[PDB]
Amino acid sequence: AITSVDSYLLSEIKPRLNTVLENCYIIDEVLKDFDYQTRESFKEAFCGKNAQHEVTVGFNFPKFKNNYEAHYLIQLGQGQETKNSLGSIQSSYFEATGDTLVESSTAIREDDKLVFTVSKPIGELIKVEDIEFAKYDNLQVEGNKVSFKYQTNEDYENYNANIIFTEKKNDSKGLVKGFTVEEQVTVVGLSFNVDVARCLDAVLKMILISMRDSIEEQQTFQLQNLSFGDIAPIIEDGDSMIFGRPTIIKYTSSLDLDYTITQDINKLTFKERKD
Amino acid sequence: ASEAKQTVHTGNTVLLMIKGKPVGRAQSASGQREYGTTGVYEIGSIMPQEHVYLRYEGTITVERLRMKKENFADLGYASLGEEILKKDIIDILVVDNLTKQVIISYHGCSANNYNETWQTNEIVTEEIEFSYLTASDKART
Amino acid sequence: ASEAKQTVHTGNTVLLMIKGKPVGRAQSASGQREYGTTGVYEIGSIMPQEHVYLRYEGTITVERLRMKKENFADLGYASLGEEILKKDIIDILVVDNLTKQVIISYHGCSANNYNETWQTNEIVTEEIEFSYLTASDKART
């Protein structure tokens, strides 16, 4: 599962950034340090659902024009290998497993059990929110649903819960081969007005923090290391310069591959020496 | 994408908790356990015929940056004199940031030594080493 | 290494009992015996023709850390003053912890010496010496 860090940044940034700019209360917390003049002018421009101006994000070397009033620019950056493992082995699995998901569900009333239903086959369960199923509950999984017994849990026919689970594909057990990669990626905000750039960079730092709690970040992209450059004129051949402070993001992740095993031993016969 | 079959723990996926309170600006922690295995040697063998467990010793260390508030001395967890004699045992829990499930818990922790460093060019740090009765990894899925 | 499979009695596997109770904070126990063996010599030759047994001496030692409750003095298994004359014999058993099977028993134990120590930073140590009538190892098979 080769990880495209650049795609992950875009997937996380685009929704979360829109949400942050949507409300004003969060922005005030973010821009608490800045002076009144810069803070409100930025808020007057981009903040709120009724903002006429809008921010954009894209990758480098596009053949079209970007909104140079305010824009996030990304470029892939360097990559390095840091740590290996014996035989390049990472893990062994009895089931072909995909991504790890979080889903919300409501308990359903069966005869002997209360069951939750999920959009896909459960495979490996990880956690149901704030439930410590005892052995007498007899927690078990079946297809796309998870079940626990009804008795002495009868108040919970309407229980509303979140579920963390994995996507199951096949029963073909296999090994993992791969290593760890230390990758760096560059991000920069652009504007023809320096004050906007500083506000824009500060907004970015917050959502990077929020990404530390994300499922993908916690499981796949770990050990953030942020580095900020000096504010510089990106462009000078024009009616006015473009100013932007580049930032560098570092990640640790695994470049993994699945190796499938077919040599399943089932029979075992003992024969003594003829002598 | 995120395949959980290969994930590992790091500093960003762990919390250190005492009495429900998450200790702040905690830097590192190390855990040691010694079963005191010893071999049995007969007369007619250089090889050890078998090994046996004899003694369980375990210590855990914690490194922290002294916050102006809620330091280990202010929290009452540590002690600086005869106040120690009135301090009861504690349980130190390492809990997962993602799920809030437990990874390992130390029961009956007791303080062994206390170290604090005042330095000019660096942030203040303090270190504590505890001795615990038993460890546990229960309450899993 | 395992509990059941180890062929040798470690200190952990053993439990010590008196009068239907375990002895808490026990530390050591020793049992010594002398059959009063002697050699027979005669004028004919220097070499001893035979060996015989004369007198049976049996003593057992125990050490313990003085608990704030349930000590020998508190429990009545040992006495300080003239009350000793009102104390009957005692029987001690050394037991397998796993199954409460008996390993060896001391019958008719009576006290000989009682020693006690206090020190600045050490744990209070209580020692006692018992002389017994017989020692038997039965009910194992």
Next chain:
Amino acid sequence: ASEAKQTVHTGNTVLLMIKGKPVGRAQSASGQREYGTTGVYEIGSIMPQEHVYLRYEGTITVERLRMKKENFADLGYASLGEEILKKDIIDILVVDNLTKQVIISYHGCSANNYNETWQTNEIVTEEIEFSYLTASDKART
């Protein structure tokens, strides 16, 4: 670990008193007893039929660091010259520090040996040996 909850008497928990005063700079204390136990033997069999008690011997030892004031010689609890004949019996108590409850008492203590040492870089050590009439452990319950 805590003061009250520890089931074992550490040296810290214990306090030693003489004649309504504590003994400062105490370092060690030992008490030994012998009931004069003996075995009964007869012609019929080697094994001892019974055990009996003959004589009661009781001694207690104490060590102390010679203070510039309130020593045993200064305090009159011990004597050097012929003044000993003018010294009566003394009673010693070993006490629980928390509540001043009694742990064990020695009655009728009289002196046997008195030892003193001086050295270049060590602390002056004062030792004394007391023989007593009886030892009792009462008023606990």
Next chain:
Amino acid sequence: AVEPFPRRPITRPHASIEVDTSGIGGSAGSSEKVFCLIGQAEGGEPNTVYELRNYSQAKRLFRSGELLDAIELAWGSNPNYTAGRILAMRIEDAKPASAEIGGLKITSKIYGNVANNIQVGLEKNTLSDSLRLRVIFQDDRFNEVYDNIGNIFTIKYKGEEANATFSVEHDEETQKASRLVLKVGDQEVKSYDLTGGAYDYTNAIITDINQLPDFEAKLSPFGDKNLESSKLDKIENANIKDKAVYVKAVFGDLEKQTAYNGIVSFEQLNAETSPIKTIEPFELTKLKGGTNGEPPATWADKLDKFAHEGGYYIVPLSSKQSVHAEVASFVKERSDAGEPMRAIVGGGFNESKEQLFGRQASLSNPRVSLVANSGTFVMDDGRKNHVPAYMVAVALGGLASGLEIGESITFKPLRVSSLDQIYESIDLDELNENGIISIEFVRNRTNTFFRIVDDVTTFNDKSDPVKAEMAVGEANDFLVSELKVQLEDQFIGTRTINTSASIIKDFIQSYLGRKKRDNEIQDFPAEDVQVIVEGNEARISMTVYPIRSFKKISVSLVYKQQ
């Protein structure tokens, strides 16, 4: 197997001591293996195998028979080599005894001719409008009594109204009576269906009725009665305003209490869709129809019952040649199936050596050994019994069960009081050379011993010790079986992702090395192992040297002067 008897409930904390002529007898010792036996035996369920840990259980369940004597030989033959645990099944297909009187079909938990000596009867208790029960099992002198049977609680209506009526309805399809309605002055307050749900237990009904301000349901203190509601009896228009109206579950109260009787089971007679024959008092009457039946012509079905039980040693208490063939065929099947076993056999009194050779000629199998000697044994209570060889076979089986895997029964002493015939040195040699195991007599200055000369199976050839000496073959058997089952768990049972032939080879060598460190095996070739893998199958081949025991010593003396 089934450990038949659980605890007896007790009533009071006490210590009781009673003189007796006999004690509790022997006890099963710690053992690696289990010993299976079949024989004539009174008591217990036919075609069922029972596990015994103590002689007390054997007496309590296998009440009498030569089988019970065999168990005594197993544990009493040698205190040092006391036999291990036991599996027992009675050959006789006994029957229960039955009595059908007073609306009740009464049958015996005991199977055999003894069962007809059971007497049970009901009596009418005029004092509380209730039935009474007594159970006496005269042979064991077991007397039981129950009183106030059926009456749970009483209802009184306290109001001034003219009439209060109590009614219970009946369902003819299933014969149940599952309704209970209180009516007063042609007006109804509540109705309780006794088919579960709202009023499953009488406890809720009592709570429900007590809540009614004009009624009180009060609990009878004579016996715990919290029966389910469905067990209440047919009741039609009982006047609640009267002094006392009883709510009755005659069978329900009987069903609970009589379950604890140690002798009897109760059934409610259906008339001969037929209504229920009323349960009524009747004379204490003998049960009838209980017999021992007859033994089967073939014991193969019995032996098949022991498959998948782990009993290495099996002994049939018989001399029939055909029966011996059945066991030999059965043991052959189990050994190939993966459950090794050994059979010990011996027939008749003082049988001729030629007849012994006749048995040898008919039967030559390493999985079986044939014992020739017959003798007498002194047993508990001082009685001494003169018995056939297959009882001696038990002593050999009980001995071999107690001995460790690596130690043979060869030359070990035996406690048997005497033997029918005293074989000479040449007589003994002929038997042993022809694969017959025998007993030898020797005399000390003032002592006498009976010894087992050597280990030999019916198989005659001396070429291969595993075939001839069961002790050697047994050592191989436990070695391989313990190895394979462990191997199955690690690779087949436990989820294994990958495996190679070499890995298996290392694991095997690790296992063998451990055995040597435990002295279970003396030596072996490390390089002789072979492993082959083919798709889902693996072949394993290896060799181990058998242990050799000490047999012959020859001595010569020379006298000289000076």
Next chain:
Amino acid sequence: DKSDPVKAEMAVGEANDFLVSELKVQLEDQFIGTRTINTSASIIKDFIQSYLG
């Protein structure tokens, strides 16, 4: 009824009574009484197991 010792033998029921009551009051102090910022089900499970041990 002899079926349940806690119901029949007050000594057994008393042991259960003091066990639970002492546990809950301690639990109330740690989480309800004392200001707790966060708590999870598993944390409670560990604390209970610590108490029983």
